[PDB]
Write an enzyme that holds these catalytic residues in place. Structure first.
Site, PDB file in Angstrom:
ATOM      1  CB  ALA A  12      -0.963   0.045   1.216  1.00  0.00           C
ATOM      2  CD1 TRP A  64       8.080  -6.526   9.477  1.00  0.00           C
ATOM      3  CD2 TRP A  64       8.984  -5.443  11.240  1.00  0.00           C
ATOM      4  NE1 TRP A  64       8.186  -5.188   9.146  1.00  0.00           N
ATOM      5  CE2 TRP A  64       8.752  -4.500  10.188  1.00  0.00           C
ATOM      6  CE3 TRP A  64       9.524  -5.000  12.455  1.00  0.00           C
ATOM      7  CZ2 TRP A  64       8.998  -3.125  10.349  1.00  0.00           C
ATOM      8  CZ3 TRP A  64       9.843  -3.620  12.581  1.00  0.00           C
ATOM      9  CH2 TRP A  64       9.589  -2.730  11.519  1.00  0.00           C
ATOM     10  N   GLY A  94       5.071  -7.044   1.762  1.00  0.00           N
ATOM     11  CA  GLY A  94       4.585  -8.334   1.431  1.00  0.00           C
ATOM     12  C   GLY A  94       4.751  -8.672  -0.040  1.00  0.00           C
ATOM     13  CG  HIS A 463      -4.163 -14.060   2.748  1.00  0.00           C
ATOM     14  ND1 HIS A 463      -4.765 -15.137   2.118  1.00  0.00           N
ATOM     15  CD2 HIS A 463      -3.023 -13.838   2.089  1.00  0.00           C
ATOM     16  CE1 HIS A 463      -4.035 -15.509   1.106  1.00  0.00           C
ATOM     17  NE2 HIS A 463      -2.938 -14.779   1.099  1.00  0.00           N
ATOM     18  CB  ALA A 497      -4.186  -5.486   4.431  1.00  0.00           C
TER      19      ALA A 497
HETATM   20  C1  LIG Z   1       5.042 -14.915   3.165  1.00  0.00           C
HETATM   21  C2  LIG Z   1       3.828 -14.263   2.481  1.00  0.00           C
HETATM   22  C3  LIG Z   1       3.168 -14.827   1.359  1.00  0.00           C
HETATM   23  C4  LIG Z   1       2.033 -14.221   0.827  1.00  0.00           C
HETATM   24  N1  LIG Z   1       1.445 -14.701  -0.314  1.00  0.00           N
HETATM   25  C5  LIG Z   1       0.600 -13.857  -1.029  1.00  0.00           C
HETATM   26  C6  LIG Z   1       0.314 -14.095  -2.370  1.00  0.00           C
HETATM   27  O1  LIG Z   1       0.827 -15.028  -3.049  1.00  0.00           O
HETATM   28  N2  LIG Z   1      -0.543 -13.287  -3.002  1.00  0.00           N
HETATM   29  C7  LIG Z   1      -1.146 -12.259  -2.351  1.00  0.00           C
HETATM   30  O2  LIG Z   1      -2.036 -11.566  -2.942  1.00  0.00           O
HETATM   31  N3  LIG Z   1      -0.897 -12.016  -1.031  1.00  0.00           N
HETATM   32  C8  LIG Z   1      -0.164 -12.910  -0.333  1.00  0.00           C
HETATM   33  N4  LIG Z   1       0.344 -12.377   0.850  1.00  0.00           N
HETATM   34  C9  LIG Z   1      -0.187 -11.151   1.432  1.00  0.00           C
HETATM   35  C10 LIG Z   1       0.176  -9.799   0.865  1.00  0.00           C
HETATM   36  O3  LIG Z   1       1.442  -9.805   0.304  1.00  0.00           O
HETATM   37  C11 LIG Z   1      -0.062  -8.762   1.966  1.00  0.00           C
HETATM   38  O4  LIG Z   1      -1.443  -8.923   2.397  1.00  0.00           O
HETATM   39  C12 LIG Z   1       0.187  -7.338   1.513  1.00  0.00           C
HETATM   40  O5  LIG Z   1       1.584  -7.210   1.287  1.00  0.00           O
HETATM   41  C13 LIG Z   1      -0.228  -6.322   2.574  1.00  0.00           C
HETATM   42  O6  LIG Z   1       0.213  -5.053   2.157  1.00  0.00           O
HETATM   43  P1  LIG Z   1       0.308  -3.851   3.216  1.00  0.00           P
HETATM   44  O7  LIG Z   1       0.791  -2.669   2.516  1.00  0.00           O
HETATM   45  O8  LIG Z   1      -0.915  -3.903   4.074  1.00  0.00           O
HETATM   46  O9  LIG Z   1       1.493  -4.428   4.191  1.00  0.00           O
HETATM   47  P2  LIG Z   1       3.020  -4.734   3.889  1.00  0.00           P
HETATM   48  O10 LIG Z   1       3.237  -4.979   2.404  1.00  0.00           O
HETATM   49  O11 LIG Z   1       3.435  -5.806   4.815  1.00  0.00           O
HETATM   50  O12 LIG Z   1       3.891  -3.381   4.166  1.00  0.00           O
HETATM   51  C14 LIG Z   1       4.125  -2.808   5.456  1.00  0.00           C
HETATM   52  C15 LIG Z   1       5.491  -2.167   5.340  1.00  0.00           C
HETATM   53  O13 LIG Z   1       5.606  -1.338   6.529  1.00  0.00           O
HETATM   54  C16 LIG Z   1       6.957  -1.465   7.006  1.00  0.00           C
HETATM   55  N5  LIG Z   1       6.878  -1.004   8.411  1.00  0.00           N
HETATM   56  C17 LIG Z   1       6.172  -1.576   9.412  1.00  0.00           C
HETATM   57  N6  LIG Z   1       6.348  -0.888  10.564  1.00  0.00           N
HETATM   58  C18 LIG Z   1       7.156   0.189  10.249  1.00  0.00           C
HETATM   59  C19 LIG Z   1       7.663   1.274  10.948  1.00  0.00           C
HETATM   60  N7  LIG Z   1       7.335   1.458  12.294  1.00  0.00           N
HETATM   61  N8  LIG Z   1       8.413   2.185  10.293  1.00  0.00           N
HETATM   62  C20 LIG Z   1       8.721   2.017   8.955  1.00  0.00           C
HETATM   63  N9  LIG Z   1       8.276   1.019   8.226  1.00  0.00           N
HETATM   64  C21 LIG Z   1       7.489   0.090   8.815  1.00  0.00           C
HETATM   65  C22 LIG Z   1       7.248  -2.915   6.754  1.00  0.00           C
HETATM   66  O14 LIG Z   1       8.659  -3.081   6.948  1.00  0.00           O
HETATM   67  C23 LIG Z   1       6.653  -3.185   5.349  1.00  0.00           C
HETATM   68  O15 LIG Z   1       7.538  -2.981   4.234  1.00  0.00           O
HETATM   69  C24 LIG Z   1       1.571 -12.935   1.376  1.00  0.00           C
HETATM   70  C25 LIG Z   1       2.220 -12.415   2.490  1.00  0.00           C
HETATM   71  C26 LIG Z   1       3.364 -13.071   2.995  1.00  0.00           C
HETATM   72  C27 LIG Z   1       4.056 -12.397   4.143  1.00  0.00           C
END
Ligand SMILES: Cc1cc2nc3c(=O)[nH]c(=O)nc-3n(C[C@H](O)[C@H](O)[C@H](O)COP(=O)(O)OP(=O)(O)OC[C@H]3O[C@@H](n4cnc5c(N)ncnc54)[C@H](O)[C@@H]3O)c2cc1C
Length: 525
Positions: A12, A64, A94, A463, A497
């Site tokens: 995101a 993490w 992710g 998820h 998410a």
């Molecule tokens: C192992 C794995 C396999 C998966 N398989 C799939 C798949 O095949 N297909 C699919 O659709 N989804 C799958 N998912 C899920 C999907 O990738 C996640 O739901 C999605 O990445 C969520 O996006 P987000 O932006 O909410 O969080 P994230 O992408 O997790 O991003 C959060 C970011 O914030 C950073 N952060 C956190 N706290 C701090 C802080 N205090 N200061 C600075 N930075 C910080 C983190 O380091 C990270 O880069 C998978 C997830 C994982 C972990």
């Protein structure tokens, strides 16, 4: 002063940093705790998209570290342990560590979001954003599709399937299931080549899509990597900046607005620590209450998973070796458990064969569950992880769906085209399938034992969602509004998410891309 500080450069946060900085007047800072993944130095383990499980065998380098969760609901006569829960810690989040599948879910999922109070988040309202984010290589020019977006989506050609995959498909056809071809624009039960995101054989994360070399050179965009936000800074009920750790040094940074994209387990923890959450919990930790928001950290969704494996007999191993599309995703199955007529298409299953481990596998999850859990703070300290309880199988319907999916698997492998292989299927944990669980045929006879096995070994699918949910402007349990604004304070949004009112019938990365696209538009408009 930054106009926007975006906490967390994941799926995101990458979208938001790109979209918000497309306007030169917006001075945007994106802050990411992990390493950068610039084009000339993507770690090899991240870059290999044909083997997208590899990050998870590289220890905790890209996650993490020591982030543990409770998984299955507490239940008499079953002991549960903390389990490591991978969450990306690097640019792309992710999307940099995931299994690379890209799917949307079902119209019903989003229509439900609007029914639950997220106005304009119905299928009609999210579809434009699913279109905007993608370039579908197979169906890009078709209705319901995009052909110009930053994120490529494609599928293997059916004709490249291995003979083992074909055998599986003939079993499913004997069950009356069609090949649906395109799971992202066709929404009934059936089987399909999974849609995925790759650039040839390379992983293509949200950072490669939205934070490319040209975006990065925008003078109004700043990117801090290996920089961790510790706290939100406040002035009355306004969020007015962030404290940031960079190596050993802490910096205070002013922001006109902060947007949390720190991930579903971490964005709500930051809210809690800021004094936004259930008043009594905050009082308990001596955190001054800015807003009494009882929904913060609640509504934690996930997909509840289990596996079934079998040693490959000679004929299965031979048949498994004939695919022409390499180790790309081959086969997905959308199916209905029958547990609750309200939730058709509540199971996702994969059937496949891996010569390397020597295993055939039928792995699956509850894709439309009934159970939710929660997270809360352990203490007020910025370096603590939250206490997380996914509370899986708290609602008995989800146990029922697991049992049903196992019975379905039994049915499919009794079909002649799968039965010919003479596989002896046995239960396994989902995340790293392996020997040691009981024979499937045996466990199913023992309902007590079957329930104990499932409550013990139920897994997730990474998820995590819903801990800072969109909801109606009068809903005491809602956390953000339709544009991600946190109720009870100013200067603060959540746009990851966390904000999903429920988990979709989908892997969460593509729904995350979509919701960050949608929130960016709301900000800009
Ligand atoms: C192992 C794995 C396999 C998966 N398989 C799939 C798949 O095949 N297909 C699919 O659709 N989804 C799958 N998912 C899920 C999907 O990738 C996640 O739901 C999605 O990445 C969520 O996006 P987000 O932006 O909410 O969080 P994230 O992408 O997790 O991003 C959060 C970011 O914030 C950073 N952060 C956190 N706290 C701090 C802080 N205090 N200061 C600075 N930075 C910080 C983190 O380091 C990270 O880069 C998978 C997830 C994982 C972990």
């Amino acid at each position: 002063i930054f106009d926007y500080v975006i906490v967390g450069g994941g799926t995101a946060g990458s979208v938001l940093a790109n979209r918000l900085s497309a306007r030169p007047e917006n001075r945007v800072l994106l802050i990411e705790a992990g390493i950068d993944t610039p084009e000339n130095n993507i770690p090899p383990e991240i870059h290999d998209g044909l083997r997208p499980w590899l990050p998870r065998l590289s220890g905790d380098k890209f996650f993490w570290p020591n982030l543990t969760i409770h998984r299955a609901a507490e239940h008499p006569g079953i002991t549960r342990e903390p389990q490591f829960y991978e969450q990306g810690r690097l640019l792309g989040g992710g999307s940099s560590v995931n299994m690379v599948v890209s799917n949307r879910g079902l119209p019903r999922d989003y229509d439900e979001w609007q029914a639950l109070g997220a106005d304009g988040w119905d299928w009609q309202g999210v579809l434009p954003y699913f279109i905007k984010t993608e370039r579908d290589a197979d169906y890009g020019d078709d209705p319901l599709h995009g052909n110009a977006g930053p994120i490529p989506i494609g599928r293997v050609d059916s004709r490249h399937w291995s003979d083992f995959t074909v055998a599986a498909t003939q079993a499913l056809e004997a069950a009356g299931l069609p090949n649906i071809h395109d799971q992202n624009a066709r929404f009934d039960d059936g089987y399909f080549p999974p849609a995925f995101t790759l650039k040839g054989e390379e992983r293509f994360s949200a950072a490669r899509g939205y934070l490319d070399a040209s975006v990065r050179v925008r003078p109004n965009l700043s990117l801090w990597t290996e920089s961790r936000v510790l706290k939100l800074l406040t002035t009355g009920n306004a969020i007015t900046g962030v404290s940031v750790l960079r190596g050993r040094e802490t910096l205070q940074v002013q922001a006109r607005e902060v947007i949390l994209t720190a991930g579903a387990l971490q964005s709500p923890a930051i809210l809690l620590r800021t004094g936004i959450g259930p008043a009594a919990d905050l009082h308990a930790l001596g955190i001054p209450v800015l807003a009494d928001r009882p929904g913060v950290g609640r509504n934690l969704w996930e997909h509840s998973s289990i596996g079934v494996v079998a040693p490959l007999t000679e004929q299965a191993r031979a048949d498994a070796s004939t695919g022409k599309a390499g180790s790309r995703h081959q086969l997905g199955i959308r199916a209905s458990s029958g547990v609750d007529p309200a939730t058709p298409s509540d199971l996702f299953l994969h059937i496949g064969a891996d010569p390397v481990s020597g295993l055939a596998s039928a792995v699956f999850w509850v894709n439309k569950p009934s159970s939710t859990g929660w997270l809360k703070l352990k203490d007020a300290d910025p370096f603590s992880y939250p206490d997380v309880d996914f509370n899986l199988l708290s609602d008995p319907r989800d146990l029922g769906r697991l049992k049903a999916g196992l019975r379905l698997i039994t049915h499919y492998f009794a079909a002649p085209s799968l039965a010919k292989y003479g596989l002896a299927l046995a239960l396994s944990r989902f995340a790293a399938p392996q020997p040691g669980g009981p024979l499937l045929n045996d466990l199913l006879q023992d309902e007590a034992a079957l329930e104990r096995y499932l409550r013990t070994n139920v897994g997730g699918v990474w998820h995590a969602s819903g801990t800072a949910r969109i909801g109606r402007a009068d809903d005491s349990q809602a956390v953000v509004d339709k544009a991600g604004r946190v109720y009870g304070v100013t200067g603060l949004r959540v746009a990851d998410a966390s904000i999903m009112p429920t988990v979709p019938t989908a892997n969460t990365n593509l729904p995350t891309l979509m919701l960050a696209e949608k929130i960016a538009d709301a900000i800009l408009t």
